[PDB]
Amino acid sequence: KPKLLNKFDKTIKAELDAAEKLRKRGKIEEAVNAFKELVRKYPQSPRARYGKAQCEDDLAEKRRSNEVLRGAIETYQEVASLPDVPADLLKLSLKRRSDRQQFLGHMRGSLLTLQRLVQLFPNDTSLKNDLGVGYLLIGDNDNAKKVYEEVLSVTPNDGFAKVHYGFILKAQNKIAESIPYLKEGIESGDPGTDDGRFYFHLGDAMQRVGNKEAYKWYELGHKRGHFASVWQRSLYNVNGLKAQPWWTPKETGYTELVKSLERNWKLIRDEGLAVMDKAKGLFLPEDENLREKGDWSQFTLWQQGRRNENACKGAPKTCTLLEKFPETTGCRRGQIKYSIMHPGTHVWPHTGPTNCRLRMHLGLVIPKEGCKIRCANETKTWEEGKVLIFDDSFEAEVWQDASSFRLIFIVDVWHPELTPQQRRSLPAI
Amino acid sequence: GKCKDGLGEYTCTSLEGF
């Protein structure tokens, strides 16, 4: 299908094929030197340069080397610099370049590449969609929004642009407006729309507006393999881990940590109240659009398995106590934090990002009435000095209708069935 | 932005190559 040979490259097709056959047979190192020889002999050949890049790309995979991949990324660029590069090959080379830049975390580099692609191919809608993904990946939702608004002005029924536009709207708390874009986008079945993120946020958006069809989309999300169940909708998972909303200390095996939290709960409370009284600013408002209403702030001691030294100056004895429990201080997919919630607060139904952690709540200051937490089909209350344990990859909902503040201590632990190797290898969240 | 209590970011993990 693709036309990759310009006029000169057609005259050396026998040599180009021989080198490419070496690559397709898995003789990567022989293919590198073969294409390198062709680049030496024919330094302007775009197909030879692309062959070199692809071989370097394969060599990077074989060696699992970022340095080798950086070489490939530059060679993909060289292809586009050569004279008389066929359009198909130019597009293939810069698209792989961008993709590999994203793989290495060179998001700004990928963005420049994607911008160049859209400039070279102004009518390729899929490339504009890719540019929007580049913006999303660096957290630039405003520019991502403009990209998809441009796509939809020309191709209003582009499903990929709809789901991503809906995703952006919901992230901006434009809940009602996001529902038709997310729904119509998924229903389009266009490549890239069968993605758990869009089922996740469509159902959540619907729950927020009182649309009872929310769970028909969680069920379909479950049927298509995006959710372990309609209740447990995390998207960064290790399959097979025991899945239940509520855990006992003994079921977790972390009984020593629970004992230490409950035996020493008053010193944890007291350092939290001291920060409340003398270092309020260490409590930061919840910033994930999870509240319908109310006031909810958190004072974080560990995140992504990293101690916040300055925060621990505000709770030094608590940080010292917890240092003995790497099952939580080393949980790179959880946090250790105080959480204050005030009356008039309602947290929408939601799930966390991963099934790789379990969440402990230690009650510190609990009004006698008005505070409760639901996980899956079961609602519970906190007790001062007592630990609750739940899996927040299951849907949770929270209410605070007391007449004074509610303070808890949150301690995330690795899921107990995760191996030591998994605990070291899983990317942080 | 980080996914701490929810799942609101386009991606919750960082990209660091191999």
Author numbering:
A (entry chain A): 330 to 758
B (entry chain B): 99 to 116
Publication excerpt:
AspH is highly unusual amongst structurally characterised 2OG dependent hydroxylases in employing only two residues, H679 and H725, to ligate its FeII. We report kinetic, inhibition, and crystallographic studies concerning human AspH variants in which either of its FeII binding histidine residues are substituted for alanine.
To investigate the structural basis of the kinetic differences between wt AspH and its variants, the latter were crystallised in the presence of MnII and 2OG or NOG, with or without the synthetic hFX‐EGFD186‐124‐4Ser substrate peptide. Similar results were obtained when H725A AspH was crystallised in the presence of MnII, 2OG, and hFX‐EGFD186‐124‐Ser, with a propionate ion being positioned to interact with R735 and S668, though the propionate was observed in two conformations. By contrast, the kcatapp ‐values for the H725A AspH variant are approximately half those for H679A AspH, in agreement with the observed lower substrate hydroxylation in our initial turnover assays. The H725A AspH substitution appears to have a more pronounced effect than the H679A substitution on the Kmapp ‐values for FeII, which are approximately twofold and threefold higher than those of wt and H679A AspH, respectively (entries 1 and 2). Strikingly, for H725A AspH, the Kmapp ‐value for 2OG is ≈200 times greater than that of wt AspH and about double that of H679A AspH (entry 3). The H725 imidazole that coordinates FeII opposite to the proposed O2‐coordination site may similarly regulate the stability of O2 (and 2OG) derived intermediates, including the FeIII‐2OG‐superoxide species in catalysis.
